[PDB]
Design a protein around this nucleic acid. Sequence first.
RNA 1: UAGUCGCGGCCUGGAACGUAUGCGUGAUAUUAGAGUUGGAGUAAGUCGUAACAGGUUGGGGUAGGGGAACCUGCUCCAGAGUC
Length: 190
Amino acid sequence: MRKRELLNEARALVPEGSGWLEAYTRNISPRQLTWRLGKRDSLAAMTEGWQLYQGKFDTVAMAALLRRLRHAQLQDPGFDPLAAQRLLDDLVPRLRSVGLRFGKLRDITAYLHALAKLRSPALLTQPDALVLDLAVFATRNRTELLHASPQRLATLLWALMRLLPPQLYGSEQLQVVLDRMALASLGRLQ
RNA sequence: UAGUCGCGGCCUGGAACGUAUGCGUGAUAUUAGAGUUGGAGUAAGUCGUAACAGGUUGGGGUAGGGGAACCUGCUCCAGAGUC
């Protein structure tokens, strides 16, 4: 019976042309959010989803969001790089509040792949401090890096090869990441 | 750095919907069978001549009349005789 109160809460965030507002739930799972961002094609729809559901996004939602941004970059014709860049700037403090406190290596690697996927040919940028701090936070624990997949680690390497400027290859945090990843991968070379 | 914090895992909650189920009121299906009528079968109860040159020349047809076989019209067919 409280669907109209839910709808008013939806109306208070997103204008009235969105199909998300009929679809809205407060008690959403992130699984459904990853699929619902996987169902959209236009940057207006991901903007609608972001201002509806900024509170419930963990790192998988950011990764699927960046893939959908690349998807709209090659399939939505009305693309604005400036709106994409300010939205990509809005993605930062959610990461620093949540994903730098609860990021497992899988999730963080998925996001960094998604961002390098955005910067891939067929220019959008993030701050490099977040990229390095995500790199050291995904590898801060040895044990999950021991159980990691080779696809994950080389995907992280391709992300760090695509995102970083050449002046920052001498940074110590990248070297700490390389230390950890060599100490993991040289045992499971085969 | 010591009560925070908690996107995420486990938990009292309401609820559309969802059998079997009850007096209404439909379908298909079943044998019981009141009760009527027809087909068939049968050595000796029985009334007349349909049928055959065959003794009123019969009949596919549609209605009438008679205790019974039946006959009465109207076009046809000759798949009844026969010069």
